[PDB]
């Protein structure tokens, strides 16, 4: 009865920016998703392909726990078939996504008076992300026709924008920590089951 180290992912000290979203591979452990679902702690816990009410009656080969931080109003974008800055340039879920999206407000931790600039998100990109793609390039985005020559200015933009995380913001603009649980299913022995 090895329990899955979800405390490492959820109760982590620091979370990654969405463009540099972090991933934790989870295998050979017993996962109690039910405790999380009924936790009164997370503001969002929506599943796709599975039903959260009795999903710990299931087994998978591996579980990917992606973690990052976004703005509250952007939590709606962490879902299959969504458009927006985050879903296009930061974190894309596939149309056939099978897994859960968990988000909780972290204003008390990831805010700072006058703005916390630790958390950034990609604002420009030549094309949309493929599902589960991670792009950490800091190349000067060329919006115009003349090359940027590695210097930014007119039609030459730095691709990452910073959240100005002040605790005085509205909810839509407060920091939310997000964990996406993806359930990978290979032709191999299934190593992550629930309590039964």
């Amino acid at each position, epitope marked *: 009865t090895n329990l899955c180290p979800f405390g490492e992912v959820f109760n982590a000290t620091r979370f990654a920016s969405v463009y540099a979203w972090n991933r934790k591979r989870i295998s050979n452990c017993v996962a109690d998703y039910s405790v999380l679902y009924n936790s009164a702690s997370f503001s*969002t816990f929506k599943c796709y392909g599975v039903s959260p009410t009795k999903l710990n009656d299931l087994c998978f080969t591996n579980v990917y726990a992606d973690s990052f931080v976004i703005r509250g109003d952007e*939590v709606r974008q962490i879902a299959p078939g969504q458009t927006g800055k985050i879903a296009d340039y930061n974190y894309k879920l596939p149309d056939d996504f099978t897994g859960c999206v968990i988000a909780w407000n972290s204003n008390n931790l990831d805010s700072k008076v006058g703005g916390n600039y630790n958390y950034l998100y990609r604002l420009f990109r030549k094309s949309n992300l493929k599902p589960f793609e991670r792009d950490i390039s800091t190349e000067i985005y060329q919006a115009g026709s003349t090359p940027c020559n590695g210097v930014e200015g007119f039609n030459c933009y730095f691709p990452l924008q910073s959240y100005g995380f002040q605790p005085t913001n509205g909810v839509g603009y407060q920091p939310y920590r997000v964990v996406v649980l993806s359930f990978e299913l290979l032709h191999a022995p299934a190593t992550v089951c629930g309590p039964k």
Partner: antibody
Amino acid sequence: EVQLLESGGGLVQPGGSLRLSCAASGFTFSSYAMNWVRQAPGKGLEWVSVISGSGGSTYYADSVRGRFTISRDNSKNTLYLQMNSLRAEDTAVYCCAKGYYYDSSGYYFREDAFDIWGQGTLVTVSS
Amino acid sequence: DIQMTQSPSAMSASVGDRVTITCRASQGISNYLAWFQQKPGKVPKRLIYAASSLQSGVPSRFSGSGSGTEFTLTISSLQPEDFATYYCLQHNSYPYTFGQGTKLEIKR
């Protein structure tokens, strides 16, 4: 425009029954949890019950447990509170309140709740 | 049962005063806290919904702060239509519980 219209209150003797309904319009009714909140005359607010959008999860205050039953017909966009074994202390104005996004697939914005309340209906239990 | 303690129970102030109402929770409720106003004979109207997030259509003199166990509703400059009763509500854990209420009266 979100709208909740209650009906079904009235005078009833102790031990009697009464079934309140709250008709909803202007939003996806089947996607949000719904609440009943009562207020006795000249006293404070008291939460009564919650039902999930799916209709699968129901939670009650202890003071009405086992007597009241919350339910919903999503096809009619209506919430119901069935009050049996009514006691005089249940005399109150009963308000219907829109809760947080609580789907068949999970919950979304658990902070955003009680944004919209029904006009309330009066339930007077007395002998 | 999480118990919400409002202070003060009653309070009288003049128009223009800065009014501060406190709500303490017996346990942690994170940010699942709302502030409602109730005029006599009317329906509760929401003023603040995520302990600090103002409701659309509510004047900016109203503001909410705090988290964990202590929370504060504040009116910067009182106004005639602000004389009412204010309730705080935790909706973190069942059963959801309101505060005892705070009635804001006119001072003479």
